[PDB]
A and B are shown apart, each in its own frame.
With several copies, the nearest count.
Chain A
Amino acid sequence: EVQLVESGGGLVKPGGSLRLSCAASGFTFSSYSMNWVRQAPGKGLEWVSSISASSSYSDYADSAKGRFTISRDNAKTSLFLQMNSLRAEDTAIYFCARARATGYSSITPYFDIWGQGTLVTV
């Protein structure tokens, strides 16, 4: 069974920093691109940041660009987000998700397993 199981959440003061860790299990982690997706309470989902299969490329939302950093380690199986300079408007549950892209019509990544997330509060 695949599970993505984030830990390293809770409260952070403004301008503080924290490391999320989407530990991964039950799938061949090296094979899949990974993403962070966050949900401000009750609000709509926001994709946070993207890492390719072997850290070759990455992408960030402007809310995260410059501030956060997605990383991965393909030894063990873990996915990290180093969130420098968290703002109050960052107060959200952050999910990770396993990403998959059936590249026949377009490279439109869809997320097929989602983590349970944890409530980064600022």
Chain B
Amino acid sequence: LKESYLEESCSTITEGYLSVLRTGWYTNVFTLEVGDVENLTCADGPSLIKTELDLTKSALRELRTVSAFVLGAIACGVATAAAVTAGVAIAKCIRLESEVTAIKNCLKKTNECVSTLGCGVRVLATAVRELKDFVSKNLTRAINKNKCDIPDLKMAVSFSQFNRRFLNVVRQFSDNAGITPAISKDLMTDAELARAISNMPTSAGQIKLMLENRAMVRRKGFGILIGVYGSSVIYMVQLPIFGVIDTPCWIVKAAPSCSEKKGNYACLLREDQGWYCQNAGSTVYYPCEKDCETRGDHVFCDTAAGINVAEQSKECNINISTTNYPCKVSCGRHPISMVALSPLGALVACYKGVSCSIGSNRVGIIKQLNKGCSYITNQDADTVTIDNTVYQLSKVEGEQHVIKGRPVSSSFDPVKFPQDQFNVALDQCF
């Protein structure tokens, strides 16, 4: 973790993050054997085993019914559309009877079997037999003459356990029209997610990373329903494949640079905020807010979202004051007072009418902040205050620098008309 404050545009770059970025998908297809419940009958009036069995029958019938510029919005749109279309394209193959029989056949005796689909994609199959096993071995033995109010209630309450996984999956597909937003524990256990990583074709290093960040693997991946085949419910889990890893990533963040250049204000905000990464030979920008998140020094992002942006674009950080690159900005007569909690220091914007201060848990007010932009490091203060709000600063330790330069809002005259503009290049605005 390292950070730089760009005085010349009231902005910070936080550098030194490693990267984990999703380049691909590994499909894991689950054969959960529900067993042929559809004609199991209880001839015995309302009972625990009956109502579990009837919920189990109903869940199966229900599941048979269900089946599948502003850079931020476009990046969000493509990231979801590409991800689901990747999985559907796999679903289209494995739904074929040739493939369902192939998957079920290799699962006949081993609860994990690798296979190659007719469409050439390779998939790990696994079999969640435990429900069919309980129904066929355990439950069928205990039921006699179709009676289900049997007194050995341990059978009933244990049945209400073994079917929990199945029922939660029928929920999660039904509520999401066959495309779940995340891999619930019910689609793929932590044991099976560890197996899926250990079996996937990636480096032991990435395996150890993924074994250390299993929640990330779970959060970025998602599930698709293939269908009920012969009283068996077929569904596929896509785990992420992180084929670019520990490359440089940085987050650019900014707050309104303003000055009273004519007694009336002028202001500027950098629009290019968010995560940038070196993606093996070009910089990629991740503008959609759902794309990137950080666990530790890694940022985890999805390469389908990333708008590829020229390597020259970093020159907005070094010299937006002079660069020929069209740095995307907003400007206008709109002084806003705010803080941006960049991880090694809060940015502050502090303008007319708004009193500003910084403090500590012990010392009280350290200082009244000046008019203008300010950069309060994690070590300068514990709190910053604007108007009467209290903002708690981050307490992360790390190197900070200031790049000096009279802010763009102060070193250029604003264009007299149109003085307000949204998401324009600076060349248009000053």
A: which residues have CB within 8 A of B?
27-28, 30-32, 52-54, 56-57, 59, 100-108
Contact, CB under 8 Å: A107 / B247: no
Given the contacts A102-B388, A105-B122, A106-B201, A54 and B24 also touching, CB distance less than 8 Å = no
A-B contact count (CB 8 A): 69
10 A-B pairs with least C-beta separation? A103-B243, A103-B23, A106-B201, A104-B24, A56-B246, A57-B205, A31-B278, A104-B390, A107-B202, A53-B247
**Would you list which residues of chain B between 186 and 226 have a CB under 8 Å from chain A?**
201-203, 205-206
Residues of B close to A104: CB separation below 8 A? 23-24, 241, 243, 390
Output the residue of A27, A30, A102, A108 with the most chain B CB within 10 A. A102
Residues of B close to A31: CB separation below 8 A? 247-248, 278-281
Contact, CB under 8 Å: B281 / A28: yes
B242 in the interface, Cβ–Cβ < 8 Å?
yes
Contact, CB under 8 Å: B18 / A107: no
Q: How far is the CA of A66 from the CA of B19 in the complex (A)?
A: 28
Q: How far is the CA of A84 from the CA of B178 in the complex (A)?
A: 46
B245 in the interface, Cβ–Cβ < 8 Å?
yes
Contact, CB under 8 Å: B243 / A107: yes
Interface of A, secondary structure class, is loop
* Chain B residue at minimum C-beta to C-beta distance from A30: B248
The smallest C-beta distance from B313 to any residue of chain A, in angstroms, reads: 13
Contact, CB under 8 Å: A30 / B122: no
The smallest C-beta distance from A50 to any residue of chain B, in angstroms, reads: 9
Indicate with 1 or 0, residue by residue over B274-298, a CB within 8 angstroms of chain A CB atoms: 0000111100000000000000000
29 intermolecular pairs with C-beta atoms under 8 Å apart = A28-B278, A28-B311, A30-B247, A31-B247, A31-B248, A31-B280, A32-B281, A52-B246, A53-B19, A53-B246, A54-B18, A56-B245, A56-B246, A57-B205, A57-B246, A59-B203, A101-B243, A102-B23, A102-B390, A103-B243, A104-B241, A105-B24, A105-B121, A106-B241, A107-B201, A107-B202, A107-B203, A107-B241, A107-B243
Q: How far is the CA of A108 from the CA of B243 in the complex (A)?
A: 9
Contacts beyond the supplied A31-B279, A105-B24: 13 A-B pairs with Cβ under 8 Å: A28-B311, A30-B247, A31-B248, A31-B278, A32-B281, A56-B245, A102-B23, A103-B202, A103-B244, A104-B23, A104-B24, A107-B241, A108-B201
Output the residue of B24, B202, B245, B279 with the most chain A CB within 10 A. B245
* Chain A residue at minimum C-beta to C-beta distance from B247: A53
B: which residues have CB within 8 A of A?
18-19, 23-24, 121-122, 201-203, 205-206, 241-248, 278-281, 311, 388, 390
* Chain A residue at minimum C-beta to C-beta distance from B120: A105
Partner of B245, one of A52, A59, A106: A52
Residues of A close to B206: CB separation below 8 A? 107
The smallest C-beta distance from B13 to any residue of chain A, in angstroms, reads: 16
Contact, CB under 8 Å: B202 / A27: no
Residues of B close to A102: CB separation below 8 A? 23, 243, 388, 390
Given the contacts A100-B280, A105-B122, A54 and B247 also touching, CB distance less than 8 Å = yes
* Chain A residue at minimum C-beta to C-beta distance from B23: A103
Q: How far is the CA of A52 from the CA of B203 in the complex (A)?
A: 11
Q: How far is the CA of A13 from the CA of B10 in the complex (A)?
A: 59
Residues of B close to A53: CB separation below 8 A? 19, 245-248
Q: How far is the CA of A102 from the CA of B311 in the complex (A)?
A: 20
Residues of A close to B281: CB separation below 8 A? 27-28, 31-32
Residues of A close to B201: CB separation below 8 A? 105-108
Residues of B close to A107: CB separation below 8 A? 201-203, 206, 241, 243
